[PDB]
């Protein structure tokens, strides 16, 4: 409960509990079900766009959530949440398939763990992508698709699902017309199991 | 006295909880935040991006860290890896902060902790009017990333806006003002506090 | 067992087992033979091509597999596979001889270990290479050759065996792929008496949007 | 003594002793007198200068020495010195106030520790600075001043004191050095009551004809 | 020879090496300096600037030395193993006229031989301040790289040129440049800073742009 959120000893104790129970390297599967991972992108900026090379430089708030019930505690008279370094926690091994640079994480690498076992990690990230830039200077604009999925965990182990101008910079050379998100389950010739992904389509165009 | 310093550092490391907000008994950690500009380096009026260097003055209190200094040092420098530090982020930065200075804080015997790095960073802010007399006005917002208003409060602190500013920049500081906000986002039920730092500057004619 | 894949305690236990057994700095040689390392590149993208300096910037999916049977376990009623951080495992010390930048690994550094002892690591990597770019703007295209082999382990310790398509190749690349061929070599250099194996990957590619009459 | 410098077990024993005594995070203050740190810069190169932005990219040899007598040992029959990773040692928290990039350390991060307790750390560094570039094409040259001081230790705790000019300077630089002068400041800022010492290095340089 | 692929033997040799290795102590033997051999074979010349006298090169840095305390009996065990360099002492070498950090392109493993010889041979990309003048002339330019121990003087570490193979044996046929020749020489030099001499190896290569 909220009147206890600032009891420091309580938070320290919860962090200790979390660190004893957490298995940073094991998927927190429950009920012989895949871990349900939620993923949405809220765009913060569009910095560089190249219509010749089909490359973009974007900043986005990647909202990522899932649950590990082994981490839950009774919060009747203790903090409902604490911030935890992600190195103490399991995080889904998500990758953006068409990213062409490493993600540059702009924000402190702390997640929130909620007393019901929900884990929230929502970093702001700048990253470069290979996507369809054609039309960026037209009224229809461009539609750049970013596919994000678990790299090493197939659909039996991890499912992914969705969790834009509210946080989009008014100062960008560009403007968002629409962001849509859909989910796919796809199998490659490499592997017999399917890998789920969230595909985020960013329709945008140069201002004016 | 070195041994006295070694002992204070030991005490600090015994008591310090680097991953726990130091809020006690019941009040959100009061964090003081102030920017003193050092330099303005790259200004792109087309892409609306700036590249700046600022002294980020950050102070707060952890009274569990306090000690009686009647016959021992008043302060020691401590590596920030040994201390809790607020998880501040500049929302409109478009690059990671480049910390130019040694990552050491001062801990004072009354529990005050001061961290004040010099930081070069790239921002997305209004650069329109930089070449005019009124100047541009670049707004930088800084607040706690994962801690809302019940856990951390963020506040302004104040001399001359150009005291530490480089005479060799192509730019000059007309005015710096800092304002506090508390904003709830559609994502979450709690408010997060921030300092909006308004830097009014123009090219030197 | 496929049903038992999501038994969490089971996964945790296999991981513990693997870490007890794994020797991350020791080649997993079995029956007095070299570790057979399989290597295959699937190109994902060609980003920058400089016809003058003969350089390319490519993203490729480097599929590496090998066997360490000491890692095997009975999966009759347990997960068939688990993901393991590469820092917990031996990984072949592969190097691209003509690369001119460090490999930029774009994906999480986890391998899959299979209950029969097969270990799979398949990172996506962006890297720059010194290669023949000549002809990239013609029908026949350019052919850029990339060599990958073990850096410190010779043929008695590690063997590399290699195993179009544009299945994973971006349709948004300025370039398109005509053919990919992969040859195995065992070469002896004057520095050293023992040979080193490599796979030589021949990427035949050309610009889309070439001048056409 | 020098005749025992290469006794390996002796060196390993000295290293062990140093690591037992060393407090990497505690200033080695003696008799409560501020640790005296010498700082000298010998310029290696000037790589790129920008008259419009007043920025300079330089490479310099940053000669830093101080003492920690707790590290001393009797070298009558053992090595007079050994090299030690700086991570095992206290190093002064020096910062260059007008640097606009992180210092790029070109050399192995080892210090020398002498048996009298002297510690020497002299890295080669490439760094960008904001400084007066004007006059670079004249004969009077330009004068770019670099200030270096302890970041968190004021004058009661650390004092800095400046320790030919082109001896290590690259003959292949587009530029040449007319003069280097090194002076000591002790400055109080509005932020804080205590003074912070610095060494101000004035580099007078110009483009070659 | 027959015993190289005995994995338990290899693990035991690694254990032995790690037990006796002193990664931070020079492996001096019988009160004499560690003899470090260093040689560069060039892989590539990437970017050249005649105005600024800067050069971007890839080279194979062949570095060898001896640590006899690591030696073992290889009669019925492997003759060599690979070892992460973090487990071993490696000479603190620096390129004096390097103007950027060395970008190591290869895995950071050395070989240790049963007779105690250690071989580390990274492929490195690095940028240098050197004489670029004459690069597009038939005579070419001559860029000189000096490499020596940074903190160990001549009583502790000697550096020696190695050994010939063709100068272009590993050089990219696709570079815009071609190597005319490479020479190496040892120097031993005293600086105003220090009483002792520091040894270095000076690599001079005359290279030119293809025409
Ligand atoms: C561009 C951003 C958009 C979101 N926004 C936020 C979000 C957050 C936030 C809240 C919760 C999390 C959680 F840890 F739960 F994942 C992360 C960030 N914090 C702050 N101070 N500002 C303002 C600037
Ligand atoms: C570049 C494309 C992206 C989609 N696709 C894959 C491959 C894989 C993948 C990665 C690694 C393995 C491993 F090595 F661990 F077995 C298996 C599948 N995972 C996902 N989510 N997508 C094929 C390559
Ligand atoms: C540009 C390179 C130079 C030689 N060459 C080598 C050298 C080496 C090699 C041999 C021995 C070592 C040692 F560990 F001993 F130092 C390192 C690399 N390994 C491979 N696979 N290829 C291929 C092309
Ligand atoms: C650009 C440099 C200037 C001095 N010089 C040096 C200095 C040093 C040196 C001496 C002592 C230290 C010490 F550890 F004491 F600090 C550091 C470097 N070593 C070598 N090999 N060369 C040659 C070229
Ligand atoms: C950038 C300007 C010029 C240098 N100057 C300072 C500030 C500081 C300083 C003082 C106190 C702290 C503290 F630890 F308290 F946070 C940090 C830096 N130190 C030095 N040597 N010079 C004022 C800021
Ligand atoms: C601190 O210690 C000193 C001497 O030990 C004593 O004067 C003092 O009362 C203590 N602190 C206070 C004033 O509370
Ligand atoms: C592996 O162990 C299981 C135990 O359930 C048992 O079936 C058998 O001993 C092994 N598997 C096979 C081949 O039956
Ligand atoms: C140092 O050691 C020498 C050699 O035994 C000895 O003669 C001398 O007394 C020692 N010096 C001191 C004061 O420790
Ligand atoms: C090493 O091998 C034999 C083992 O039969 C051992 O007894 C002896 O010490 C060594 N002999 C040599 C030098 O090969």
PDB file of C-alpha atoms in Angstrom, chain D residues 1 9 12 24-25 37 39 41 51 54 56 64 68 70 73 80 90 121 127 138 142 148 150 152 155 163 185 207:
ATOM      1  CA  UNK D   1      69.376  -1.529  -5.941  1.00  0.00           C
ATOM      2  CA  UNK D   9      60.001 -13.315  -6.823  1.00  0.00           C
ATOM      3  CA  UNK D  12      55.936 -10.280  -7.051  1.00  0.00           C
ATOM      4  CA  UNK D  24      42.831   3.091  -4.130  1.00  0.00           C
ATOM      5  CA  UNK D  25      39.925   5.297  -2.982  1.00  0.00           C
ATOM      6  CA  UNK D  37      50.761  16.293  -7.169  1.00  0.00           C
ATOM      7  CA  UNK D  39      51.554  17.738 -13.389  1.00  0.00           C
ATOM      8  CA  UNK D  41      52.305  18.374 -20.194  1.00  0.00           C
ATOM      9  CA  UNK D  51      39.354  28.546 -36.333  1.00  0.00           C
ATOM     10  CA  UNK D  54      37.642  27.520 -31.498  1.00  0.00           C
ATOM     11  CA  UNK D  56      41.627  21.943 -30.998  1.00  0.00           C
ATOM     12  CA  UNK D  64      51.942  13.071 -13.166  1.00  0.00           C
ATOM     13  CA  UNK D  68      52.592   7.673  -0.905  1.00  0.00           C
ATOM     14  CA  UNK D  70      53.063   3.964   3.073  1.00  0.00           C
ATOM     15  CA  UNK D  73      60.044  -0.471   1.004  1.00  0.00           C
ATOM     16  CA  UNK D  80      63.976  -0.138  -6.812  1.00  0.00           C
ATOM     17  CA  UNK D  90      45.146   5.753  -5.756  1.00  0.00           C
ATOM     18  CA  UNK D 121      51.830   7.802 -13.961  1.00  0.00           C
ATOM     19  CA  UNK D 127      41.784  14.982 -26.189  1.00  0.00           C
ATOM     20  CA  UNK D 138      50.108  34.559 -37.939  1.00  0.00           C
ATOM     21  CA  UNK D 142      47.605  31.230 -31.291  1.00  0.00           C
ATOM     22  CA  UNK D 148      43.895  20.855 -15.200  1.00  0.00           C
ATOM     23  CA  UNK D 150      41.639  17.988  -8.976  1.00  0.00           C
ATOM     24  CA  UNK D 152      36.717  16.835  -6.027  1.00  0.00           C
ATOM     25  CA  UNK D 155      43.594  22.793  -1.910  1.00  0.00           C
ATOM     26  CA  UNK D 163      56.945  20.083 -12.959  1.00  0.00           C
ATOM     27  CA  UNK D 185      46.226  28.873 -10.055  1.00  0.00           C
ATOM     28  CA  UNK D 207      50.543  26.533 -38.807  1.00  0.00           C
TER      29      UNK D 207
END
